[PDB]
Amino acid sequence: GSQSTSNHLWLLSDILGQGATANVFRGRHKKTGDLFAIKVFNNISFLRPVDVQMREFEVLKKLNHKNIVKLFAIEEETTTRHKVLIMEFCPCGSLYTVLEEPSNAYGLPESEFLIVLRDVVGGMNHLRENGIVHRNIKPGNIMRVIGEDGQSVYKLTDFGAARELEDDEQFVSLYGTEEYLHPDMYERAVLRKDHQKKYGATVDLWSIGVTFYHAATGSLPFRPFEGPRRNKEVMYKIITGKPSGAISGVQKAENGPIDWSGDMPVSCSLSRGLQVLLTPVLANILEADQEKCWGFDQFFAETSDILHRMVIHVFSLQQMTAHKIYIHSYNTATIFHELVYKQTKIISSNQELIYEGRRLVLEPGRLAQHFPKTTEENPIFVVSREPLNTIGLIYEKISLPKVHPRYDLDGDASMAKAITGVVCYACRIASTLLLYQELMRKGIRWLIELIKDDYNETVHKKTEVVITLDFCIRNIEKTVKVYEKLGEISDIHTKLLRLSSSQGTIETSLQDIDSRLSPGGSLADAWAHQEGTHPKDRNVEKLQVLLNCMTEIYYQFKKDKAERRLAYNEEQIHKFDKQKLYYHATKAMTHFTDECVKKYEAFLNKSEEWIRKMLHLRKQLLSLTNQCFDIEEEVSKYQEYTNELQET
């Protein structure tokens, strides 16, 4: 069976989505053969008043955006003469399709997540300008397309639950999915509890809030033990009893206590600087009370505050940590040091910056626009003088789910995704560990070369200091000899001889430091090229190979799950590949824990020692340099004492 129109034709076999009122089919144009999404209304929809079915058509006419799926034309089917919608086709799937990829099981990358935020807001903002509410915002209703620049672009669709609504106009009707439903709408739609309430446009922001937490963590904010489906009552108690500010809540036992948390889970894949901005945003937009809830202006202000911010990559040698500093293009270096202090706890005055081999000096009022180009591979380093605990990288240690001998195809494919998702997360940490050690080797190399510059300039000063002093003591000796031929002077020589003797000891102790900076002087960076891992070890490429064999089985298990039943051939191979998948995953985790992690552990342990070796040396080099300056400001009073004896 297949339907057709005047300018379009589609198969009933190609179904993009299946909704209540209508379905959406992958179809082609009759003349050009180009792909378009055809939405066909079923007869059930025609048993609604003439105003409801009118809006959805009058809505798409007024709406056209880059973050909204473009409606090209409205035509009639050849037989039923039903109104069909010619929508823009998005072959890349929906946001739901993306979140099914095992790599995103523990949250989207920091890059693809910001795109989602950028496009969703932009689509919702365009709905706000026209005054259209959606009331059904789910990852399934957010499509994804590949732009000309490769960057993903997200558009909103499925406006079957949409209608024209004024800025302050309320309603009583119900729309939306279960998990992404507002506490007040969940009260009537799921538990069905009428306390005589009305709903504004705040219900859109909740559906957005739940969706956003799902993209960054890989799971829903509020999770009962049985789940939102198996136990609907617990789901409602969490959202209506949630403390103001909390962004998540999960019970870990059947009919037990609920664990609320006002912070992102460690499993998240976002930077620390991004979570600082995100957490308060999710806190206020997620609450039952309309008073404490945010408005669109307060929503857009904070989101546009984040999207306008650029990113300056900063790596701290002292703590061995990587940071993404989210700063505005119009902020100064003063605000920059504040933002770095908030994460790394380093005082603004102790922050010495290093970039591409050289130390970096910042003007107190230079804008962030003119800051040097930074990447994770080549960021700006921050080494402190004040001692700090080397924390390193923090990640949630996650193991493989237990495998049942059960044959359940739905369970195997679901186990396949989960277990492929754990290896994807393990591979993500391994590649991060490799970056930390490599930036460490580059940072330490740059640091020891920088200290040599301090040593060299100090010596140049010491040579400049010793010349003035040796001439001064030589010039007075001639003066006191012509006196004997024909109090102060005696008191001057005492200090001068003591200075020359102390200057001599400095000269010797500086050679000791030079012996420390010398190759193999305990401060050498030769240890770093042994202890930890190297890019030449190709540990990540190894993990990726096993992961390639795992993702091959997983996508095959989906097609086996899609068949519902399998022939004898595909059945027994599925039983065989189930252990092969497990033997691949266990080999990876074994290789991950025994090779990648351990070599990084030993690198972190030997890093702390060298840091303490460095901090000690820079202190001694500091004092000796200051002693050269103390004499420098002392000879300024000396060079004008004896040399000014010849005024007239």
Ligand X SMILES: O=C(NCCCNc1nc(Nc2cccc(NC(=O)N3CCCC3)c2)ncc1I)c1cccs1
What residues make contact with ligand X under the rule CB under 6 A?
16-19, 22-24, 37, 69, 87, 89-91, 93-94, 97, 140-141, 143, 157-158, 160
User: How many other C-beta atoms lie within 10 A of the C-beta of residue 543?
Assistant: 25
- State which residue, 69 or 327, has the beta carbon closest to ligand X: 69
Choice between 257 and 405, CB closer to its own copies: 405
Local structure of 22: helix, strand or coil: strand
Task: Please spell the DSSP secondary structure of 219-252, one letter per residue.
Answer: S-SEE-SS-TTT-HHHHHHHHHS--TT--EEEE-
Contact of residue 158 among its own copies, ligand X, none (CB under 5-8 Å per partner type): ligand X
Cα distance between residue 238 and residue 241, in whole Å? 5
Q: Nearer Cβ to its own copies, position 214 or 584? A: 584
Stretch that binds its own copies, among 77-85, 410-418, 498-506, 568-576 (CB under 8 A): 568-576
**112 sits near its own copies (criterion: CB under 8 A):** no
Residue 31: name its binding partner from its own copies, ligand X, none (Cβ under 5 to 8 Å by kind): none
Distance CA 376, CA 435 (A): 8
Residues 6+ apart with CB under 8 A from 406: none
7: which DSSP letter? S
Assess contact for 408 and 532: CB atoms under 8 A. Answer: no
Residue 210 structure tokens? 């739940």
Nearer to ligand X, 22 or 447 (CB): 22
364 contributes a contact to its own copies by CB under 8 A:
no
Pairwise CA distance, residues 588 & 441, whole Å? 26
Q: Can you tell me which of 338, 356, 363, 512 binds its own copies, judged by CB under 8 A?
A: 356
Closest contact distance (angstroms) between CB of 145 and ligand X is 9
CB of 108 to its own copies, least distance (A): 19
Residues in contact with its own copies, shown as a per-residue x/- string from 296 to 335 under the rule CB under 8 A: ----------------------------------------
Closest to its own copies by CB, 149 vs 291, is: 149
Structure tokens at 475: 């010039």
Residue 157's binding partner out of ligand X, its own copies, none, with CB under 5 to 8 Å set by partner kind: ligand X
Residue 132: its H or E element: strand 132-133
Whether residue 264 contacts residue 270, with contact meaning beta carbons closer than 8 Å, is answered with yes
Q: HEC profile for 295-344?
A: CHHHHHHHHHHHHCCEEEEEEECCCCEEEEEEECCCCCHHHHHHHHHHHH
* DSSP-derived pairing of the beta strands 8-18 and 2-4: antiparallel
Compare residues 356 and 386 and give the one whose CB is closer to its own copies.
356
Q: Is 150 in the site for its own copies (CB under 8 A)?
A: yes
Cα 129 from Cα 91, distance rounded (Å): 28
Residue 634, H or E segment: helix 598-635
Q: Which stretch binds its own copies (CB under 8 A): 71-79, 144-152, 332-340, 400-408?
A: 144-152
Does position 377 interact with its own copies (CB under 8 A)? The reply is yes
| Measured distance CA(548)–CA(411) in Å, rounded | 21
Least CB distance to ligand X at residue 69 (A) = 6
Q: Does 33 bind its own copies (CB under 8 A)?
A: yes
Count of CA atoms in the C-beta half-sphere (13 A) of 190: 23
First to last CA, the chain: 119
Q: Which is nearer to its own copies, 58 or 541 (CB)?
A: 541
**Near its own copies by CB under 8 A, which window of 66-74, 232-240, 328-336, 571-579?**
571-579
**Residues within window 515-554 making contact with its own copies, judged by CB under 8 A:** 538, 541-542, 544-545, 548
- In this chain, which stretch among 51-59, 190-198, 441-449, 598-606 interacts with its own copies, using CB under 8 A? 441-449
Q: Which residues contact 637 (CB under 8 A, 6 or more apart)?
A: none
In the complex with its own copies, the residue whose CB is nearer, 548 or 636, is: 548
Q: How far is the CB of 538 from its own copies (least distance, A)?
A: 5
Q: From the list ligand X, its own copies, none, which binds 541 (C-beta under 5 to 8 Å, kind-based)? A: its own copies
Say which entry of its own copies, ligand X, none residue 609 contacts (CB below 5 to 8 A, set by partner kind): none
Residue keyed to tokens 């080549």: 378
Measure the CA–CA gap between 640 and 461, rounded to whole angstroms: 19
Under 8 Å between Cβ of 55 and 162: yes
The only residue of 42, 78, 130, 151 in contact with its own copies, by rule CB under 8 A: 151
| Binder of its own copies out of 49, 61, 148, 637 (CB under 8 A) | 148
Q: Of ligand X, its own copies, none, which one does residue 460 interact with (CB within 5 to 8 Å by kind)?
A: its own copies
Q: Among 244, 572, 605, 636, which residue sits at the site for its own copies (rule: CB under 8 A)?
A: 572
Contact 323, 273 (CB under 8 A): yes
C-beta of 32 vs 79, nearer to its own copies: 32
Of 158 and 184, the one with the shorter C-beta distance to ligand X is 158
Nearest approach, Cβ of residue 189 and ligand X (Å): 18
Binding piece for its own copies, criterion CB under 8 A, among 208-216, 297-305, 445-453, 592-600: 445-453
Return the DSSP state at 638.
T
Per DSSP, the residues of 451-520 read HHHHHHHHHHHHHHHHHHHHHHHHHHHHHHHHHHH--HHHHHHHHHHHHHHHHHHHHHHHHHHHHHHSTT
The binder of 16, among ligand X, its own copies, none, by C-beta within 5 to 8 A per type, is ligand X
Which residue lies nearer to its own copies by CB, 29 or 345?
A: 29
The option from its own copies, ligand X, none interacting with 646 (CB < 5 to 8 A, set by class) reads its own copies
Taking the complex as a whole, how short is the minimal distance between the CB of residue 24 and ligand X, in angstroms? 4
What is the nearest approach in angstroms of its own copies to the Cβ of residue 485?
14
- Please report how close the Cβ of residue 71 comes to its own copies at its closest, in angstroms: 23
445 binds, among its own copies, ligand X, none (CB under 5 to 8 A by kind): its own copies
Q: Which of residues 452-491 bind its own copies (CB under 8 A)?
A: 460, 464, 478
Buried/exposed code over 17-48 (b: 16+ C-beta within 10 A; e: otherwise) = bebebbbbbbbbeeeeeeebbbbbbeeebeee
DSSP state of 522: S
Rounded least distance, CB 534 to its own copies, Å: 9
Q: 413 touches which of its own copies, ligand X, none (CB within 5 to 8 A by kind)?
A: none
Nearer to ligand X, 141 or 217 (CB): 141
CB-side neighbour CA atoms (13 Å) of 136 = 16
Whole-angstrom Cα distance, residue 509 to residue 241?
Answer: 68
Judged by the rule CB under 8 A, the positions of this chain that interact with its own copies are 32-33, 146-151, 356-358, 377, 442, 445-446, 449, 460, 464, 478, 538, 541-542, 544-545, 548, 572-573, 576, 646
